């Protein structure tokens, strides 16, 4: 079972600033990582697939990068609607697994 480590758990940033969420896999998994956003009382939302690919309907400020065991979800000019929980998920080996999540805080 691939282990995805998200750290720090909580992230604090000032409005407008660029922020970077981190996800490290217990083993090389290519670019088979994906990001989801979950706001309070809401369900998960695919933000980035296969590490970097963007999803239509998702603000262009959201971008991702990395490969192997290190991945980063980044967000330019952070704004209040960006306040929620982030999670990573790998599809490299069965079974799929999730990160422990990271809370964004402005």
């Amino acid at each position: 079972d691939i282990l995805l480590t998200q750290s720090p758990a909580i992230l604090s940033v000032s409005p407008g600033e660029r922020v970077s969420f981190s996800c490290r896999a217990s083993q090389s998994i290519g670019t088979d990582i994906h990001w989801y956003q979950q706001r309070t009382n809401g369900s998960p939302r695919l933000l980035i697939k296969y590490a970097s690919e963007s999803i239509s309907g998702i603000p262009s400020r959201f971008s991702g990068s990395g490969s192997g065991t290190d991945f980063t979800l980044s967000i330019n000019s952070v704004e209040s609607e960006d306040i929620a929980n982030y999670y990573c998920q790998q599809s490299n080996r069965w079974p799929f697994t999730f990160g422990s999540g990271t809370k964004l805080e402005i």
Partner: protein, 103 residues
């Protein structure tokens, strides 16, 4: 048209069909097995092709029994198909040589 040609096409149609079924079946068989990688169709399709051609990159391979069974079918179809084409090329070459030799 002629027979060996018809059989070559037949080999190609079937090969494509086996590669596709091959991808579906591989995934269905591999998901559920901890540590398995043959678990998404796109790459499973690419694994199929590698296998049929025997180019064997080693970046993907089954780890479950049905997966390997599926694998065998793909390998044989690949080998058989490409071999049947080689024979088709030989027959064509033998026939023409007969003509060119006024036989």
């Amino acid at each position: 048209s002629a027979l060996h040609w018809r059989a070559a096409g037949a080999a190609t149609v079937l090969l494509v069909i086996v590669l596709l079924a091959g991808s579906y079946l591989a995934v269905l068989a591999e998901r559920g097995a901890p540590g398995a990688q043959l678990i998404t169709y796109p790459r499973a399709l690419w694994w199929s092709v590698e296998t049929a051609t025997t180019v064997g990159y080693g970046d993907l391979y089954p780890v479950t029994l049905w997966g390997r069974c599926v694998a065998v079918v793909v390998m044989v179809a690949g080998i058989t198909s490409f071999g049947l084409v080689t024979a088709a090329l030989a027959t064509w070459f033998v026939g023409r040589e007969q003509e060119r030799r006024g036989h």
